[PDB]
Amino acid sequence: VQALVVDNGSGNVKAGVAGDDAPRAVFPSIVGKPKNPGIMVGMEEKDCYVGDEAQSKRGILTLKYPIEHGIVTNWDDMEKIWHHTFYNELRVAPEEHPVLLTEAPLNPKANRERMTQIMFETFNVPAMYVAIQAVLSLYSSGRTTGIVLDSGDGVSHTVPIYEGYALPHAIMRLDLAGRDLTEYMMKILHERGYGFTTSAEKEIVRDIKEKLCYIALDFDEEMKAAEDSSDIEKSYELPDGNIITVGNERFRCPEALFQPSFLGKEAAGVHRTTFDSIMKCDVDIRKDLYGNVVLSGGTTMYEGIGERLTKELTSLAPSTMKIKVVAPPERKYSVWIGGSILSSLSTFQQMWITKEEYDESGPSIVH
Amino acid sequence: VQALVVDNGSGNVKAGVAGDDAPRAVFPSIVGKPKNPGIMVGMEEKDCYVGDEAQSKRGILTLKYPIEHGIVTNWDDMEKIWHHTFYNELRVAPEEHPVLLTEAPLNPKANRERMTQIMFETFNVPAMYVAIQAVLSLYSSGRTTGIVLDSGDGVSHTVPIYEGYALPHAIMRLDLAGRDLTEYMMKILHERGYGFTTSAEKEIVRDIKEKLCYIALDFDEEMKAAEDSSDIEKSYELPDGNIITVGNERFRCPEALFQPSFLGKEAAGVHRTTFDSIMKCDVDIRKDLYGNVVLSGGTTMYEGIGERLTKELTSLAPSTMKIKVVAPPERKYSVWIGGSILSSLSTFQQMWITKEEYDESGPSIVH
Amino acid sequence: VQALVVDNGSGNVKAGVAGDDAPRAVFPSIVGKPKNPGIMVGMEEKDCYVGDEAQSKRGILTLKYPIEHGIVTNWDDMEKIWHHTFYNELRVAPEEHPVLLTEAPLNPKANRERMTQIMFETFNVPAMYVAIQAVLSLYSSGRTTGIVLDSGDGVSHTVPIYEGYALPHAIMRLDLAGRDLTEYMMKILHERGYGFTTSAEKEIVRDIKEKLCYIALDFDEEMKAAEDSSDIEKSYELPDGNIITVGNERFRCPEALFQPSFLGKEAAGVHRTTFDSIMKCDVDIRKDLYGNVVLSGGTTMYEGIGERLTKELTSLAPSTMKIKVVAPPERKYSVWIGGSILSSLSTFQQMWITKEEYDESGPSIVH
Ligand SMILES: C/C1=C\[C@H](C)C[C@H](C)OC(=O)C[C@H](c2ccc(O)cc2)NC(=O)[C@@H](Cc2c(Br)[nH]c3ccccc23)N(C)C(=O)[C@H](C)NC(=O)[C@@H](C)C1
Ligand SMILES: C/C1=C\[C@H](C)C[C@H](C)OC(=O)C[C@H](c2ccc(O)cc2)NC(=O)[C@@H](Cc2c(Br)[nH]c3ccccc23)N(C)C(=O)[C@H](C)NC(=O)[C@@H](C)C1
Ligand SMILES: C/C1=C\[C@H](C)C[C@H](C)OC(=O)C[C@H](c2ccc(O)cc2)NC(=O)[C@@H](Cc2c(Br)[nH]c3ccccc23)N(C)C(=O)[C@H](C)NC(=O)[C@@H](C)C1
Ligand SMILES: Nc1ncnc2c1ncn2[C@@H]1O[C@H](COP(=O)(O)OP(=O)(O)O)[C@@H](O)[C@H]1O
Ligand SMILES: Nc1ncnc2c1ncn2[C@@H]1O[C@H](COP(=O)(O)OP(=O)(O)O)[C@@H](O)[C@H]1O
Ligand SMILES: Nc1ncnc2c1ncn2[C@@H]1O[C@H](COP(=O)(O)OP(=O)(O)O)[C@@H](O)[C@H]1O
Ligand SMILES: [Mg+2]
Ligand SMILES: [Mg+2]
Ligand SMILES: [Mg+2]
């Protein structure tokens, strides 16, 4: 009997069995419902268009994300997503193995309580545990000291840890992630006459962003250079065979991470958030936090993010410090691998919240 | 079988085996307890953060001194400190060798009685002896006549001795030591905008004081000179890489030894205390006491203390006398070396207080 | 010709003319700058959005406090605030009347020197004086003996005074005030799903705190009672008409004054700080200090603070003492009224620092 590890993000669902090196089932976290009447008699009108099945036939479906900034907004569809994960992707009986789940820090308590109640009463798991994503990202890297910058589709958070002890008063959360960048890309592609509006057009723009975008080392000089020559342009082919050309948007779209004012948000960039999280720690801790910054999440996968973040932090921190940003090649799956490591430890076997405790202490047993 | 010599101060613990020329184990006398919850499963949550181990990871610990003005205020942590000394630093079995301890003069009797009871019942030593620090400082210097000014972290005392005979009615005690100077430095560094509050920040200010401070030959002229030029300033680098600059505080901080009114204390300086201890002696003794003043303790390590004390005593004593202050290079370890000399004498073998006497005569056997 | 009294705090500016019973102009100490481009031609783009004008249209402005823990961090905006006070609120010529200012104890000297230079060179006042807030709070109460606990938006300090003589070595300063409580309220409102991030959202949370919070007599029993019934809940209406409900946060937020560990700060509560300030005084003074404790500042306006502080001090002080906490109804304006009383005394006319002295003795004339 091995635990199941299900990392539940705003954009993707990563599921698998503890002990594996990689998640065996990764599919987008969408639920689709048809927007047209079915006319041919003799077909099967499936209700659960979940994940890649909904992605494949998004032409006749309207797509909805049940998780928004890490908070579940539609529990009915989230239950469908969980059922899909347990029965069609992993193809296991959930009542046999305990399940390890993840949740972003500084989340409302009702979210976790509803999650626990749904797991214990609908799917009937023997036990569970809910862990923070940022501490698992540190488990994946085999280290006990460092500050983790996790950025996914819903929310970015920084969690500093020193010698295994957490520093909860220094945790920062920034609701600026990949979905905001996709929407900004949709907005600024209108400058060239490309109009994207539909839910499927959103998934097209997301695919454009994931391939053509990169982070410039400095923004103003790169702007001035781009206005002079056309070698920055690139071409992308739409599903129907139409060809579009993208220019300085390639480095304009991800710049909003460091300048949120591009999105109309009154906030500070990821570099400034990292620096301010470090500065809330004790003076003796700061050197080891500067010396080890961990990148996690898919949003940190832009080419050149490490150099840019190192330059910003070096410009902010005193000249004596040696800023070292750690960007593993597999940092898109750091949280899942960390959870896989955590669930297999012999020490962790006492933290399982069995159903007998839940029925004894109510939903608040998780806290 | 050789005796163990443990000099137990308010700030540091000096331990070793009799016959050595120097203490083999010197570590600060602090006990730390974590102030944060441990979040990573798979680490060891040690309870005894004692000495340099607590000093190394003071960022996540709160630090407490179990001895205050030479009187033990927390016996539970003092027992931890003694266990650490016996088992992790010296790495000996305490039940094999007798232990020689030290205690400041004019201390309450309950302190010594509790110390003896803890040693005999918890650690089970074959024998012990408790000696005054000031007479051991005279043993270290190979002399029988002179007045000893011992100043450590908790309390300053002067003990005059003539031809081996003590003069107990002339003993003076002044509760003004290194810890008071560290707190005064913390207070007056706020004039420049440097705020130090935490327990670890106290250890940072102590390190600043131990390197940048010195004693001016005269205070008012040095003030007037410092206000004219900036060559007195010096720079110090904080743990995180920030740089601070200190000015006249360098000679303002140790001036409180000679002017306790800087600390708000209604008392007299160390020079005046020394003079008044001398004047309580017989007229025939005073010449040999003026001719030999012994400096002991770490607080007397400021550059220029000898010249200042000689000037003060010369201004107080009659012009015929030749004041001679003795400042050995190793006066930071005078008490321990004196105890090492004392415990190795063949004459001293009769003063051991064995356990059989203790069980016969109660805790009062020490007196 | 009557003096002007300007009490300059971290959160609010209280200004007026000496001889009045109350400050005629009280407005928040904020400077706002627009974060949007102006599109309508024919409007006036004012630069100085200061005080209530910035508060009224905070939707399109970003708000910044130029004073942080009683130390001015942005002199350019502080000059704007002072100009606003002198010309739009009081509507007087500053070069006609002398100005009396206030400053928190244990402040860096450069702050006061820059303040004096700005007043004498930009606004050209005939004279000035800078006074400590805590001694003015004692003037307002018509008393010469007592210990004053002043707590505002930036810093809390306790200053004991006996028979008119100050005891500067017993002064304590605690950087924990109303702004920290507002930030803690923002943090712990996330438990219910309420997210407040913007500068204007900070002013919304401050208004929530000022009305719904109170201090429980004991914390654990009140917790246990709150978990049983919902009668502790209350509702608050947001600017746009949305309704939020607050529960045990009402007495959780101000508890951080007595348990700073809630904020992640390694410090002691206000009761412990008061007790430790008393214990640094002479034994003969302590009875009259216990018998008269003065509350000053807006942070001490929570319902039930007097009973809680009396209970804590009674539990700390010996059973013989009768702890009496004095909480005037108008203690939010104690410092200003005390300054108004002080400036009108005939004795005080010799302490004015005229411009002729300043030009003669440099900025250090204030000290
Ligand atoms: C971009 C795509 C196809 C493209 C036709 C592929 C080719 C390659 O692009 C062009 O030919 C550029 C051309 C264009 C028109 C004028 C111009 O000075 C420059 C370019 N653009 C147009 O005609 C606009 C007009 C428009 C509609 Br209506 N609303 C909008 C909202 C904002 C902006 C513009 C518009 N147009 C018909 C569209 O966007 C349509 C709706 N877009 C799509 O179906 C997406 C899924 C794929
Ligand atoms: C001194 C240190 C770092 C420093 C930042 C290193 C640099 C080099 O110093 C400066 O930049 C000087 C600057 C300053 C500010 C205003 C001014 O007219 C002159 C100097 N001082 C400040 O901003 C004060 C403000 C302050 C707090 Br809040 N409470 C206090 C209590 C008393 C006095 C002042 C304050 N400040 C943020 C601190 O002290 C912080 C808490 N101190 C530390 O973390 C320690 C461990 C190390
Ligand atoms: C509190 C306010 C309005 C409210 C909407 C008024 C109504 C009355 O509250 C609700 O309906 C509660 C609901 C909620 C959602 C899930 C849940 O299990 C319980 C409650 N909360 C939400 O949807 C969160 C989601 C969220 C964002 Br995004 N980041 C966050 C950071 C931390 C926590 C949560 C979040 N949400 C949209 C907000 O906070 C927005 C940004 N808040 C505001 O604009 C402020 C100025 C006023
Ligand atoms: N190679 C890539 N380059 C840039 N962005 C990417 C890349 N791969 C994924 N992303 C972005 O990462 C976001 C979500 O990634 P992920 O870390 O899985 O988030 P979640 O934690 O919500 O599952 C997507 O919105 C996508 O835009
Ligand atoms: N080189 C130095 N210069 C100035 N002060 C020092 C120096 N070394 C140590 N001290 C001070 O001496 C104090 C304690 O020294 P020590 O004599 O070991 O005291 P104790 O008898 O309590 O062990 C410390 O508080 C430290 O501030
Ligand atoms: N009625 C009230 N109840 C609770 N807190 C209050 C009340 N009125 C004001 N405050 C708090 O007092 C703080 C500042 O008050 P004040 O004493 O004017 O400070 P300052 O000295 O900085 O002007 C504000 O941050 C506010 O949160
Ligand atoms: Mg994720
Ligand atoms: Mg000593
Ligand atoms: Mg005030």
Swiss-Prot record, chains A, B, C:
CDD domains: ASKHA_NBD_actin. PROSITE patterns: ACTINS_1 (PS00406), ACTINS_2 (PS00432), ACTINS_ACT_LIKE (PS01132). It is found in: Cytoplasm, Cytoskeleton. Keywords: ATP-binding, Cytoplasm, Cytoskeleton, Hydrolase, Nucleotide-binding. The keyword Cytoplasm applies. Its EC number is 3.6.4.-. The keyword Secreted does not apply. It catalyses: ATP + H2O = ADP + phosphate + H(+). Belongs to the actin family. Component of a complex, at least composed of ald-1, microneme protein MIC2 and ACT1. Interacts (G-actin) with ADF; the interaction results in inhibition of actin polymerization. Interacts (F-actin) with ald-1. Actins are highly conserved proteins that are involved in various types of cell motility and are ubiquitously expressed in all eukaryotic cells. This is Actin. It comes from Toxoplasma gondii. The lineage of its organism: Eukaryota, Sar, Alveolata, Apicomplexa, Conoidasida.
